[model samples]
Target chain A: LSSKYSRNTELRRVEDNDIYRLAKILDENSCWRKLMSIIPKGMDVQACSGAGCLNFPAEIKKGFKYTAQDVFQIDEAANRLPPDQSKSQMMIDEWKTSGKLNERPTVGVLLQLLVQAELFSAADFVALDFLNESTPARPVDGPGALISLE
Target chain B: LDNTMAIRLLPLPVRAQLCAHLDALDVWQQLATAVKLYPDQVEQISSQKQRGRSASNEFLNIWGGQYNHTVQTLFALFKKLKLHNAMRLIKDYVSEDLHKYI
Candidate 1:
């Protein structure tokens, strides 16, 4: 895996078997044919963006599924704020992503990373998913210690 | 209150920790669904565990029946696949001592 891609670079480490498992699952699953078509086209075996871009297929893009771009947004949002101040930012990012995030493909890549990074705990995956899926209402009063609910 | 509100009300670190547990459960479920489709492999892995029984079995047996075999196989696969982080989650999920917290 090339260090250039956030998917590979951000991960703690990568393993041979992890790659093998990814290949096996993707090859066997027809639903991911579009993802497969675009991923290799990237050619670097690292990142999925740029010239060989990996946007969702036309059909899926039209649907409610979140794209890799959404993940990038969350990554960007997380980096933009301090840990304590980032909670609401993450919540809003996730809320937006959750509305359209494609479960199978999105979760698949995240799980792939989780599996490859031997040091990450399940809690880490959970936290990752929370950042990807959890939707909390913005506190009506505005940003504060306590977030309000309807 | 709903899970979401409860989550928001907690201290930030604790909320983050709890949210991670929620995600781990989702990972567990996804892994379970995939394993269910391949019963033969599940059985084979379970047999391997029994044949090479170790202290791990003592903990694994706690969630006996189909669940025990299924989890044991996933645990083995994660380690075999070198997904160390995932392996720990499986172990932590099935650990008797951790049962209280879970």
Candidate 2:
């Protein structure tokens, strides 16, 4: 990863930064992916056996089953596994790059896939912070306190 | 109460201190959206082109240029970022008296 930083300053100007904060925030919180493996955030890393073990809940009605790979546009088979962080990042990147999910992707679209993936916590944070797909809440408002910047 | 004038009138010393306090929380990236910067602008700023200064300070330096940027706006921004420790930094400076009395 250290070598990634050696880029000449010129490259920085050209790359159009189209990716939203959704991508960056998801990348930063790779911990959110561990829940798929049943290893949850802030818990020990007990790896999953295969796709059978990941959190993709199937629907008997459609007779169409989906894995994180299926829902996320990952090329890999969903049953297999890798480091949760890398796989999660791949899912996010593909969601951005691929047109399969939604032609004009938005947080709402992502949240729907999040439900299918059963990645509830990430979806909650996504809606609460990144997307605001859902709504509700207030805060410590009412007190008019000010402090000098000095 | 468009604090436009009040925010605009902020002296260099106060701006510098707020930037310093905020920079410590490492929230520059998160703050971009909160302060109304576009996603692409936030990405460009974080691109590591400027190596010497912290990203937070750099972003803060430009935060007020395009907005009404009042103390209330700054207060709300701090709360949005969940920077409780840093939010208090503002309270120490503005008293109800200065606001109510004036």
Candidate 3:
């Protein structure tokens, strides 16, 4: 409903606590599709959700949020890793236990890394979902360019 | 829609290129999806904490490294898929924000 943190603007200025919190809420709500729709935008991406196999956690909590410094820290810290270790099952399992995963493009760790890559304010990431999805009433691409239907 | 009849939307070369990008993206996309698991896992840990139950280090170990890997994997995927546009988009998005925060 709000683009509090636009991906084009926020970056490290957002908070990890907020993203972590959102992850918990969406998991508990089981509104995976809605969450999926919003994540890519937060990371600054415009695309459809993917279909894949996931080892999701069994339970979740709803009342959580992120802070600015934490987003910066997490994103900054993520930049130093070898390529082979990026998508390991062990890594996936570890994040699942923390309630901080984004599970979509343009949001989550992807946005965090992008923010870090560009040295943006990680704190702003707290509102990435808002910015990425906030296509103006008039989009650069015609309204028909993006399909909105069930 | 199922691939019922032969519906050729784009040219064969374009279709092939698109599929190639999509295939690479399949891996790139997982990087983000991996983070999606943290909430539920953390909740379980929190519940155990509330109950004065001792959570094992194994769980913590897994939780600790999740996000770092997600970032790395995404970057790798972009390189592998040769999605220069998307890669640049991500870079530009972050760079623009960095300037704002600075």
Judging by lDDT against the true structure, name the best candidate: 2
Residues A30-133, model 1: lDDT tens digits: 21222322321112223331222333343233443445574356546656876433322342234323322222123224433222222122213222432342
- Candidates' C-alpha lDDT: 0.32, 0.42, 0.31
Q: Candidate 2: global Cα-lDDT?
A: 0.42
Q: Which model scores highest in TM-score? A: 2
Put down candidate 1 lDDT per residue, B1-102, tens digits, no spaces: 211211112244542443355344434323333333244334444454457532222122221221212333334444433445554554433434322322
Q: How do the residues A28-127 of candidate 2 rate in per-residue lDDT, one tens digit apiece?
A: 3243243232312221111111112323233222232234545344435433665443445455454334333213234443444444433343444454
Q: Which should have the higher lDDT, number 1 or number 2? A: 2
DockQ of each: 0.02, 0.04, 0.02
TM-score comparison, 1 vs 3, better candidate: 1
When only chain A is evaluated, what TM-score does every model earn?
0.22, 0.34, 0.23
Error of 2 at A5 (Å): 53
What tier of docking accuracy does candidate 1 attain? incorrect
**TM-score (0 to 1) of chain B, per candidate?**
0.27, 0.66, 0.24
Instruction: Please give, for residues A6-54, the per-residue lDDT of candidate 3 as tens digits.
Output: 4333223346555454444223223222222222222212221111111
Residues B30-69 of candidate 3: C-alpha lDDT, one tens digit per residue:
3223333345555654465467543322122222222211
